[PDB]
Design a protein around this nucleic acid. Structure first.
Ligand SMILES: CC[C@H]1CN2CCc3cc(OC)c(OC)cc3[C@@H]2C[C@@H]1C[C@H]1NCCc2cc(O)c(OC)cc21
Ligand SMILES: [Mg+2]
Ligand SMILES: [Mg+2]
Length: 127
RNA sequence: AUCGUAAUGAUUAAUAGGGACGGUCGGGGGUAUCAGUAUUCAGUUGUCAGAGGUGAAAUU
């Protein structure tokens, strides 16, 4: 029936990666970031840039033959934030609204089982 | 020295303490040992123009 890729959406708070691979992830099909859609750094992670990135990703997927994708959303994780960035929701809605078919959705944010020391110092970053 | 007298001679066990013992109970300690993902670094792979960071930037 359908041909599945894997839409690996990495939504940090400074950028948004929309990366579609095969099932294994060893073959990259399309990787469009929110920074390729705007010329200002402050909105590289904007929902608008993520939507444009997703539309370009869907267009590239269609001409290669990918008709459906599984979703692996992730935040920065590690010692940094575990909540996904603002662009991951827009890239997901744009992908679903672009004619690509959606399979399983999962959050794959890296979470330590403890961890290393987090930047900022003992008193945190004072603002 | 022996013998005879005598009701012959030792206070409780403290909701003080100490000790023993019996099933436990603890992220109490020491010495080994076994996980976990994460971080970074490295090796292979895949694409292609940005990535990072910020209030905005810039160093990179
Ligand atoms: C860390 C040293 C200063 C440097 N200056 C330059 C001018 C400027 C202009 C802004 O607006 C154009 C702006 O955005 C807020 C931030 C700044 C920064 C703020 C900072 C003061 C800090 N101490 C208290 C106030 C405050 C508030 C914040 O939100 C905030 O976040 C980074 C930080 C702070
Ligand atoms: Mg303050
Ligand atoms: Mg007693």
């Amino acid at each position: 029936s359908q041909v599945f890729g894997v839409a690996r959406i990495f939504a940090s708070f400074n950028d948004t990666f929309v990366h579609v691979t095969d099932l294994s992830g060893k073959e990259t099909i399309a990787r469009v970031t929110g920074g390729m859609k705007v010329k200002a750094d402050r909105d590289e992670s904007s929902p608008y840039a993520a939507m444009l990135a997703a539309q370009d990703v869907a267009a590239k997927c269609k001409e290669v033959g990918i008709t459906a994708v599984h979703i692996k959303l992730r935040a920065t994780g590690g010692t940094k934030t575990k909540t996904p960035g603002p662009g991951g929701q827009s890239a997901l809605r744009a992908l679903a609204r672009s004619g690509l078919r959606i399979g399983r959705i999962e959050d794959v944010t890296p979470v330590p089982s403890x961890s290393t020391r987090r930047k900022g110092g003992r008193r945190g970053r004072r603002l």
